[PDB]
Enzyme design. Structure first.
Site, PDB file in Angstrom:
ATOM      1  N   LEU A  12       0.834  -1.196   0.000  1.00  0.00           N
ATOM      2  CA  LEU A  12       0.000   0.000   0.000  1.00  0.00           C
ATOM      3  C   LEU A  12       0.871   1.250   0.000  1.00  0.00           C
ATOM      4  O   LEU A  12       0.752   2.103  -0.879  1.00  0.00           O
ATOM      5  CB  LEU A  12      -0.909   0.009   1.230  1.00  0.00           C
ATOM      6  CG  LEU A  12      -1.949  -1.111   1.313  1.00  0.00           C
ATOM      7  CD1 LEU A  12      -2.634  -1.079   2.667  1.00  0.00           C
ATOM      8  CD2 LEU A  12      -2.961  -0.949   0.191  1.00  0.00           C
ATOM      9  N   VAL A  20       3.300  -0.590   4.885  1.00  0.00           N
ATOM     10  CA  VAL A  20       1.971  -1.178   5.006  1.00  0.00           C
ATOM     11  C   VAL A  20       1.593  -1.978   3.765  1.00  0.00           C
ATOM     12  O   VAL A  20       1.878  -1.566   2.641  1.00  0.00           O
ATOM     13  CB  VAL A  20       0.903  -0.091   5.233  1.00  0.00           C
ATOM     14  CG1 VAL A  20      -0.466  -0.731   5.387  1.00  0.00           C
ATOM     15  CG2 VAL A  20       1.252   0.727   6.464  1.00  0.00           C
ATOM     16  N   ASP A 135       0.769  14.263  14.801  1.00  0.00           N
ATOM     17  CA  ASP A 135       1.116  14.279  13.382  1.00  0.00           C
ATOM     18  C   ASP A 135      -0.130  14.287  12.502  1.00  0.00           C
ATOM     19  O   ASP A 135      -0.302  13.432  11.634  1.00  0.00           O
ATOM     20  CB  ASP A 135       1.996  13.069  13.041  1.00  0.00           C
ATOM     21  CG  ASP A 135       2.509  13.104  11.612  1.00  0.00           C
ATOM     22  OD1 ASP A 135       3.104  14.127  11.213  1.00  0.00           O
ATOM     23  OD2 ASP A 135       2.324  12.105  10.887  1.00  0.00           O
TER      24      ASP A 135
HETATM   25  N1  XJ0 Z   1      -5.294   1.838   3.621  1.00  0.00           N
HETATM   26  C1  XJ0 Z   1      -4.641   2.040   4.762  1.00  0.00           C
HETATM   27  N2  XJ0 Z   1      -5.166   1.613   5.920  1.00  0.00           N
HETATM   28  C2  XJ0 Z   1      -4.537   1.806   7.066  1.00  0.00           C
HETATM   29  C3  XJ0 Z   1      -3.312   2.461   7.082  1.00  0.00           C
HETATM   30  C4  XJ0 Z   1      -2.650   2.667   8.289  1.00  0.00           C
HETATM   31  C5  XJ0 Z   1      -1.423   3.316   8.364  1.00  0.00           C
HETATM   32  C6  XJ0 Z   1      -0.802   3.495   9.595  1.00  0.00           C
HETATM   33  O1  XJ0 Z   1      -1.378   3.055  10.615  1.00  0.00           O
HETATM   34  O2  XJ0 Z   1       0.298   4.088   9.611  1.00  0.00           O
HETATM   35  C7  XJ0 Z   1      -2.790   2.894   5.867  1.00  0.00           C
HETATM   36  N3  XJ0 Z   1      -3.458   2.674   4.749  1.00  0.00           N
END
Ligand code: XJ0
Length: 274
Positions: A12, A20, A135
């Site tokens: 992602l 991620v 942040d």
């Molecule tokens: N689609 C998606 N869903 C959850 C996250 C979480 C990122 C994080 O917790 O840094 C990032 N992208």
């Protein structure tokens, strides 16, 4: 055991907050986001009830892991030799405010009013649970394209909420308040209002107002886009140099521009055409 539990997918995203992936819960085929963090890049660790040395990000998440969909939820976590694997819920479809804004440029005040409001409610939830995100920005805000809801993500820069003063900071600089840029001192609540001020501007203008310390330290705000006489107020109010002169989450929501806000569905049904 992992693996046999989650089916990892494509990457992602990544960065200074970790990496991620788009995994799926083999159990019920539930879309989830797998996050990885090296034990060496962890700024400050935390502590769990059962006395277990785990990352702070985990401690923060668990403290806000409620039915409230205003913030990302931590489904489960795991520990490894030199890293941790956090399992977070994953909206579908979804797009972070950053890409959304870059896509559709500036946003209509109506749409902003909705987002910004949901954000406030979200942030309030965090603080209400003794958690400070530290942040807040477009990149850390997801959009449930369907239900038109927003969620806060990545708490790697956050920490336990305290009424004292913070001398450290690891979040995005351009969003950091002037008090920090200069004296490296600030208070969560007051500081949060500043970041929100930047965000709000980022939405109505399509980009952040300040790019350099000198600009932040000064505090002079210029609008490159057409913004309601009132919106500019709320924005400048949050971006007030002196923290004490900044609005509170209450005063902010009671602000004239924060009235007759649209509902999550209506918003998506109007601006997200769904
Ligand atoms: N689609 C998606 N869903 C959850 C996250 C979480 C990122 C994080 O917790 O840094 C990032 N992208």
């Amino acid at each position: 055991p992992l693996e046999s539990q989650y089916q990892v997918g494509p990457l992602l995203g990544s960065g200074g907050f970790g990496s991620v992936y788009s995994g799926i819960r083999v159990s019920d085929n539930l879309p989830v986001a797998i996050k990885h963090v090296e034990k060496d890049r962890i700024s400050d660790w935390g502590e769990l009830p059962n006395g277990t040395r785990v990352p702070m990000e985990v401690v923060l998440l668990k403290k806000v892991s409620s039915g409230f969909s205003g913030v990302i939820r931590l489904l489960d976590w795991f520990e490894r030799p030199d890293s941790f694997v956090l399992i977070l819920e994953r909206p579908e479809p979804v797009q972070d405010l950053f890409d959304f804004i870059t896509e559709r440029g500036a946003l209509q005040e109506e749409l902003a009013r909705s987002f910004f409001w949901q954000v406030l409610e979200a942030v309030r939830h965090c603080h209400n649970c003794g958690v400070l995100h530290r942040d807040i920005k477009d990149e850390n805000i997801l959009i449930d394209l369907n239900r038109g809801e927003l969620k806060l993500i990545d708490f790697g820069s956050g920490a336990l909420l305290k009424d004292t003063v913070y001398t450290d900071f690891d979040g995005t600089r351009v969003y950091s308040p002037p008090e920090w840029i200069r004296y490296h001192r600030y208070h969560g609540r007051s500081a949060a209002v500043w970041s929100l001020g930047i965000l709000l501007y980022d939405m109505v203008c399509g980009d952040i107002p300040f790019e350099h310390d000198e600009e932040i330290i000064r505090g002079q705000v210029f609008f490159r886009q057409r913004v309601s006489s009132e919106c500019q107020h709320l924005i400048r109010w949050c971006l007030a140099l002196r923290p004490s002169d900044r609005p509170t989450f209450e005063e902010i929501q009671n602000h004239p521009w924060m009235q007759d806000v649209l509902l999550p569905q209506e918003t998506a049904e109007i601006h997200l055409h769904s």
